[PDB]
């Protein structure tokens, strides 16, 4: 009652017919896997961002009016 004990025969044919998809990689992949002491921290970075938006907005408008003046001084 003996038989075959493997083969990897047509096969190439199969796990290949539908393709072999090189894994569709998004931007913005998961941070799960990373050392907790990164995340522990970068969440205090991410959480206390808005504290410091007043600077951010004014300091934007400074650069925006300085570059409205740079492009207008070119004109």
């Amino acid at each position: 009652a003996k038989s075959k004990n493997h083969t990897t025969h047509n096969q190439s044919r199969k796990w290949h017919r539908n393709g072999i998809k090189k894994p569709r990689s998004q931007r913005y992949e998961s941070l799960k896997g990373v050392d907790p002491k990164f995340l522990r921290n970068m969440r205090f970075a991410k959480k206390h961002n808005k504290k410091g938006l007043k600077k951010m907005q004014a300091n934007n408008a400074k650069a925006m009016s300085a570059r409205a003046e740079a492009i207008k001084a070119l004109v």
């Binding site: 096969q11 199969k14 796990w15 290949h16 539908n18 072999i20 998809k21 090189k22 894994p23 990689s25 992949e29 896997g33 990373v34 050392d35």
Partner: protein
């Protein structure tokens, strides 16, 4: 049927090459890795802690972690069809900066530079690479010789 053990068939991979049996040159763990950087795995005998394993000895992947003496690294591994982008935790010793990317970067730095310049001209410069064209009509010249006559040489049995 064979043994599954993690380090079968590694007798002669992980084996350090020649006359390098010993102190791991220190440079190889004082160059900086950081997430995004592409890295070639290359297993090593000397240090066994934080080894990769043969099914990715000699692959490349990007780095996604950096721990105190290891680098979490995402590599693609083929497995009866479906390739799996998958993540391992390999100690620095077994890793390098692949220069794979580093033709491009030097090609970028050149193209942005050659585009910003020749914009004040407006002349269109050949930015893309292009495969090796057919070799152009040239001439040759002999001067004061005819060429040398070859004859196939008569066989005699050497031993």
């Amino acid at each position: 049927t064979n043994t599954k053990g993690k380090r079968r068939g590694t007798r002669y991979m992980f084996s350090r090459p020649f006359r390098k049996h010993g102190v791991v040159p220190l440079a190889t763990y004082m160059r900086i890795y950081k997430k995004g950087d592409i890295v070639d795995i290359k297993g090593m005998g000397t240090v066994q802690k934080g080894m990769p394993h043969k099914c990715y000895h000699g692959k490349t992947g990007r780095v996604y972690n950096v721990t105190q003496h290891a680098v979490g690294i995402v590599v693609n591994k083929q497995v009866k069809g479906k390739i799996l982008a998958k993540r391992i935790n390999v100690r620095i010793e077994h890793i390098k900066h692949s220069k794979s990317r580093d033709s491009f970067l030097k090609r970028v730095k050149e193209n942005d530079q050659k585009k910003k310049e020749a914009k004040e001209k407006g002349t269109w410069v050949q930015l893309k690479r292009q495969p090796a064209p057919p070799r152009e009509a040239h001439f040759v010249r002999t001067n004061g010789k005819e060429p040398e006559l070859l004859e196939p040489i008569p066989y005699e049995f050497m031993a």
